[PDB]
Amino acid sequence: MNAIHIGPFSITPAARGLHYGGLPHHQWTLYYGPREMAIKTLPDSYTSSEVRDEFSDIIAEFVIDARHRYAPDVLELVNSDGDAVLARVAVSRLPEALSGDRFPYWLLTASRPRLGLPVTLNEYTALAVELSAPPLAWITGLLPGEVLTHDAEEWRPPTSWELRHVVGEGSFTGVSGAAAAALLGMSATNFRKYTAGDSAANRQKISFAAWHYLLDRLGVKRAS
């Protein structure tokens, strides 16, 4: 009857069980941090991974909701007075020269309010290199800004709960602790001092530079 952890998710059994149809069950609750997500009444004869699996659909649609809810803005390349979209690019930040003929392409916002700027192809290229969003940028939709900021005066190290958004096989990147450690050039043992049940008594937290470098290597947030 031990509680189960899938990255930042938690499935816990209630303190006392119950009989249902003469057999012992327990109600298990799915938690995303403090948010209660789902309740299911499960036979005690269920293994741990039987409990775990019964909730993996509700988790999957959470992810789906988050990939959409936090998807980056998208820019569109069209011919100057052309008629089709020639390319699209997701961008984690908008170009500062956007508003309402020497140039042969327009870079357009894919959503209203429509902002545009005229660009040569080399200009479009430089912009996309600079601004392109990385594959898992939507995970930043779930982390607090104190953790994401490059302002060393306001930066707060992530908690193990926040770290588990991005490392751990049940995390939203799927990338395990041991792989994460190698990215940072540390031992698996040393990196796991940051993500543990007892990590509150581990005085060494992840460094500002390691964390932002990590988020880049995992494809969550460009170091720029």
Numbering used by the authors: 1 to 100, 105 to 228
From the paper:
AcrIF24 is a recently identified Acr that inhibits the type I-F CRISPR-Cas system. Interestingly, AcrIF24 was predicted to be a dual-function Acr and Aca. Aca proteins are transcriptional regulators which commonly inhibit the expression of acr genes by forming an acr-aca operon. AcrIF24 is dimeric and binds a short inverted repeat sequence in the acrIF23-acrIF24 operon promoter to repress acr expression.
The purified AcrIF24 protein sample was successfully crystallized and diffracted to 2.5 Å. The crystal belongs to space group P6522 with one molecule present in the asymmetric unit. The final structural model contains the complete AcrIF24 sequence (residues M1 to S228). The overall shape of the AcrIF24 structure resembled a bird and was composed of three distinct domains. The wing domain was formed by five β-sheets (β1–β5) and one long α-helix (α1) at the N-terminal part of AcrIF24, while the body domain was composed of six α-helixes (α3-α8) forming a helical bundle fold at the C-terminus of AcrIF24. The head domain was formed by four β-sheets (β6–β9) and one α-helix (α2) was localized between the wing and body domains. Because the electrostatic surface features are sometimes important for predicting the function of a protein, we analyzed the electrostatic surface features of AcrIF24. This analysis showed that AcrIF24 contained a highly positively charged cleft in the bottom part of the body domain, although negatively and positively charged surfaces were evenly dispersed in the AcrIF24 structure. B-factor analysis showed that most of the head domain had relatively higher B-factors (average 88.25 Å2), indicating that the head domain might be flexible. PPI analysis showed that the complex formation significance score (CSS) of the MolA/Sym1 dimer was 0.2 (the score ranges from 0 to 1 as the relevance of the interface to complex formation increases), while that of the MolA/Sym2 dimer was 0, indicating that the MolA/Sym1 dimer might be the biologically relevant form. However, our intact, fully folded crystal structure of AcrIF24 indicates that AcrIF24 can be in ordered conformation without binding to Cascade.
